[PDB]
Design a protein around this ligand. Structure first.
Ligand code: HEM
Ligand code: HEM
Ligand SMILES: [Cl-]
Ligand SMILES: [Cl-]
Lengths: 181, 181
């Protein structure tokens, strides 16, 4: 199954450390996030919100970028990676109406998204889900996990991304910080 | 709503003229196709099959290409567009694991998908839907409609595309030919 659901409420494998409502309307604070590998129609009891999205194909990265990523990126579920951060993102209509070269140019040529992210590997593990195509309020669910040592670096990475040309098209962002139970 | 469903069975706005099972397991012949703008979980009565997909953002076309398409491409549901073809396509794992430059190159540089297709506009209208990401048996639903004067031409277009490098990656294809009621 390529579909993943994230349920904020009173149960789950993760503990909410904090939520930062960076841009746009925020998400309600909850005790825990429950993550599932399937669609969930039945909104669980004592749960404030459901996010969902699917794993998909590459949309921007070229072969050499892929090769570079594969050489250093860590797997998920390292025993040390006890911290995680869920970051929903929505981009603007002006971004989506742009052609594929335009988007590619802003993504790597101007914002160096891959080159910058590579500096934070192997400390940081990541998963990218898509959800615009499902009719969700956000376009993307981004997932990061790392050991505490790397929390500082990760905060540094967030502030760099937010300074890029790419982030000018971002109209909604929340940080959910998590600790594995 | 970005989601479209296509049900084969005994009702619909379109009459099945024929079904050609081009490559891989085919679709059961039926009398009619019902086309809905939404999901359909409730498998309709006396129906053989259901295909669905969503309209999505551009994945390959560059801005100059988009400009050429917009100059000529017809709208859907012209009075004279009484013939249609629905063509589900599945591409191979090997296609899907390739990077974004690699697919772009096979699609346009080697296959000239857009340059070739542009020779058949404005006679042919088209819609493109995606459904790998929903876990369908097909990766894509393609939709083409035109006046009969253009049928021969449309047939030439199919044979050109299928001789392309792109089409070596296609592992399942069915043409459903229709007539408007
Ligand atoms: C930590 C290292 C990171 C690496 C190595 C990295 C790498 C990548 C790569 C290669 C893609 C393109 C995937 C594709 O072609 O389909 C991507 C997409 C994305 N990344 Fe990152 N990323 C990192 C961190 C982050 C962070 C911190 C954020 C946001 C807070 C972020 C947000 C995104 C978004 C939204 C996309 C999808 C872009 C779109 O389709 O418009 N990334 N990431
Ligand atoms: C009639 C003129 C045609 C034109 C102008 C045309 C144009 C295009 C364009 C520009 C794209 C790229 C969309 C994007 O970047 O998101 C595309 C995708 C596609 N076209 Fe065509 N097309 C035509 C006919 C056909 C026919 C007859 C078929 C199949 C029988 C076909 C199958 C496809 C498929 C499967 C894709 C998606 C490829 C992918 O995302 O991997 N096209 N078409
Ligand atoms: Cl990923
Ligand atoms: Cl289209």
């Amino acid at each position: 199954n390529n579909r993943y659901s994230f349920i904020g409420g009173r149960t789950g494998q993760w503990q909410v450390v904090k939520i930062r409502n960076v841009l746009g309307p925020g998400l309600q604070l909850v005790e825990k996030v429950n993550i599932l590998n399937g669609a969930v129609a039945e909104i669980p009891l004592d749960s404030a919100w459901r996010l969902q999205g699917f794993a998909s194909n590459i949309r921007y990265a070229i072969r050499t970028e892929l090769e570079a990523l594969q050489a250093v990126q860590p797997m998920l579920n390292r025993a040390e990676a006890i911290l995680a951060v869920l970051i929903p993102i929505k981009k603007s209509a002006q971004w989506w109406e742009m052609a594929q070269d335009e988007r590619r140019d802003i993504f790597e040529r101007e914002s160096h998204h891959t080159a910058v992210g590579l500096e934070y590997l192997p400390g940081v593990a990541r998963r990218l889900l898509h959800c615009r195509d499902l009719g969700e309020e956000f376009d993307f669910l981004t997932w990061f996990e790392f050991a505490p040592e790397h929390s500082s670096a990760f905060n540094e990475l967030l502030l760099r991304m937010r300074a890029s040309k790419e982030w000018e098209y971002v109209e909604r962002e929340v940080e959910v910080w998590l600790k594995r139970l």
